[PDB]
Design a binder for these strands. Structure first.
Ligand code: NA
Ligand code: NA
Length: 327
DNA sequence: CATCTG
DNA sequence: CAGATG
């Protein structure tokens, strides 16, 4: 956690680059388990040889750790941090819609900067385009002060459309966090479930409303169950308009809400721990449901849930207020 | 995993 | 449809 930091970090630097720049998924994947192992390793790595001992620990990595431990740097890491090409990919990538794949193409085309991008706005797709339009806005964190404002609107409109909808703002917003990055709304309707054959409108209906009122501004992507968009808090009294915020709306059968809800709330750590105990207490948890574990190895069947309570209950545990859902 | 593109 | 992005 601090004993093998530099090492683990460099490796991550190394792993990152392999995938994003080069296409080395194997290599990439190498640096990964490696840092993962040195990550848990209880001692102070004092040498390559020492490390090499570890699994995932090859000679090349060793080699690397040596130079690092040996000198406070790594030549390769040094070359890469310069390499404008590498750099470019790292950057171009910040743009929503631009993955690495994309990144390489543009670069080999010579599109390297933000300006490069505008000049060639033709070459980008819609997402890619919104992404560009709101680069800053996008990168700007979201303050709970505004978070509550957003929540307010969304929830009110969802109400008007149908009294039977159930919306929920999951995320760290939900775990108390002072600022979030984007807004995740989980949605269900009684009339929707596991077996219940579809009802897209169920999602489309609200989408429309939010745009109606101008909350939603653009569409990133819009399917039958997941909407990816852009929204905005109505600039009050002209002087201070809001930033553009990322927002997702997703439909879920009412029959697997809370699990989702639980799940989307996090944190990853809470989940795990909650997930493990689940296992102890003779159960299973995942994104959509909790199931009684069979002894034959495993087994299934939908445990019926009406709240985040019912879940915990099953695993006989203390209801955790979302704030303390931290770890 | 669900959506988009081409 | 394989493939990319979130
Ligand atoms: Na991107
Ligand atoms: Na292939």
């Amino acid at each position: 956690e601090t004993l093998n930091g530099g090492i683990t970090d460099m490796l991550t630097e190394l792993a990152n680059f392999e995938k994003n720049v080069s296409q080395a998924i194997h290599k990439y994947n190498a640096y990964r388990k490696a840092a993962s192992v040195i990550a848990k390793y209880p001692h102070k790595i004092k040498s390559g040889a020492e490390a090499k001992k570890l699994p995932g620990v090859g000679t090349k990595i060793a080699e690397k750790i040596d130079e690092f431990l040996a000198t406070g740097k790594l030549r390769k890491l040094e070359k890469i941090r310069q390499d404008d090409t590498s750099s470019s990919i790292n950057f171009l990538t910040r743009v929503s819609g631009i993955g690495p794949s994309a990144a390489r193409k543009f670069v080999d085309e010579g599109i390297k900067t933000l300006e490069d991008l505008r000049k060639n706005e033709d070459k980008l797709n819609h997402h890619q385009r919104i992404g560009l339009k709101y680069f800053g806005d996008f990168e700007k964190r979201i303050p709970r002060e505004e978070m509550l404002q957003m929540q307010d609107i969304v929830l009110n409109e969802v109400k008007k459309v149908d009294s039977e909808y159930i919306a929920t703002v999951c995320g760290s917003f939900r775990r108390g966090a002072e600022s979030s990055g984007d807004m995740d709304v989980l949605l269900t309707h009684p009339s929707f479930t596991s077996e219940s054959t579809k009802q897209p409108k169920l999602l489309h209906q609200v989408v429309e409303q939010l745009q109606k009122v101008h909350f939603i501004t653009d569409t990133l992507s819009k399917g039958e169950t997941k909407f990816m968009g852009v929204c905005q808090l109505p600039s009050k009294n002209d002087e201070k308009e809001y930033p553009h915020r990322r927002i997702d709306i997703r439909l879920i059968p009412k029959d697997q809400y809370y699990c989702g809800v639980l799940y989307f709330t996090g944190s990853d750590i809470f989940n795990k721990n909650m997930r493990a105990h689940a296992l102890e207490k003779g159960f299973t948890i995942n994104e959509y449901t909790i199931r009684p574990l069979g002894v034959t190895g495993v087994a299934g069947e939908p445990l019926p849930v009406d709240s985040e309570k019912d879940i915990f209950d099953y695993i006989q545990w203390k209801y955790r207020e979302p704030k303390d859902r931290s770890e």
